[PDB]
Amino acid sequence: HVPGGGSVQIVYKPVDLSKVTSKCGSLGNIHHKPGGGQVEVKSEKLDFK
Amino acid sequence: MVKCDPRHGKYMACCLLYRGDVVPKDVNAAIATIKTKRSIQFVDWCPTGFKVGINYQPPTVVPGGDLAKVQRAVCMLSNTTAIAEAWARLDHKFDLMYAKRAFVHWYVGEGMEEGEFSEAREDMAALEKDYEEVGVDSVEGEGEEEGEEY
Numbered sequence: 526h527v528p529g530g531g532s533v534q535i536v537y538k539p540v541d542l543s544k545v546t547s548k549c550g551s552l553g554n555i556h557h558k559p560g561g562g563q564v565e566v567k568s569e570k571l572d573f574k
Numbered sequence: 575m576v577k578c579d580p581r582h583g584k585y586m587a588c589c590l591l592y593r594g595d596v597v598p599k600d601v602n603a604a605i606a607t608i609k610t611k612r613s614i615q616f617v618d619w620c621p622t623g624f625k626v627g628i629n630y631q632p633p634t635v636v637p638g639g640d641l642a643k644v645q646r647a648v649c650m651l652s653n654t655t656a657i658a659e660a661w662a663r664l665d666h667k668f669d670l671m672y673a674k675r676a677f678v679h680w681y682v683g684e685g686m687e688e689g690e691f692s693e694a695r696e697d698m699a700a701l702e703k704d705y706e707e708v709g710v711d712s713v714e715g716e717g718e719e720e721g722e723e724y
Contacts, residue, residue, distance in 0.1 A: 538673055540669050545700040549707050551707065
């Protein structure tokens, strides 16, 4: 007989962050909205016709 | 009271619970110094940053107690990217111990599936990335401004 055991394997496994996916509201934007209307439309020059 | 340095992150917000003998104009000035005092930095998208409350009652005295009498007191509560240091620490510790599956069997004998533990890590991986998404200052100059790193 040959004594000294057979063989036994270690428990060890590789690791990864799985390309995981979540929500982001901030990622959906790069630009701001244009301004409101700064201009008068009511004014009249009061000509006596 | 959590042992991560707050200067690593920037503040998403602060709440300050003030007690007892407090004059509001002293809270005003203080937070006006702190909101310009350069060691305290806030996220680019919370220029308001603050929540107060002012209570008339101080804390009280305790027999054989460990804290002493003050005319006024303050709890703060604070949220900041600084706490990601812990996410990174579970990310560290799991990648040490669970990579060799040590102690897993005690869980598996007790109504877990190894599939949940796997999920819960991925949610944690998503959460440090969700924390890293929010702390960053806002998209600016992209496409238009000259390079800064060489």
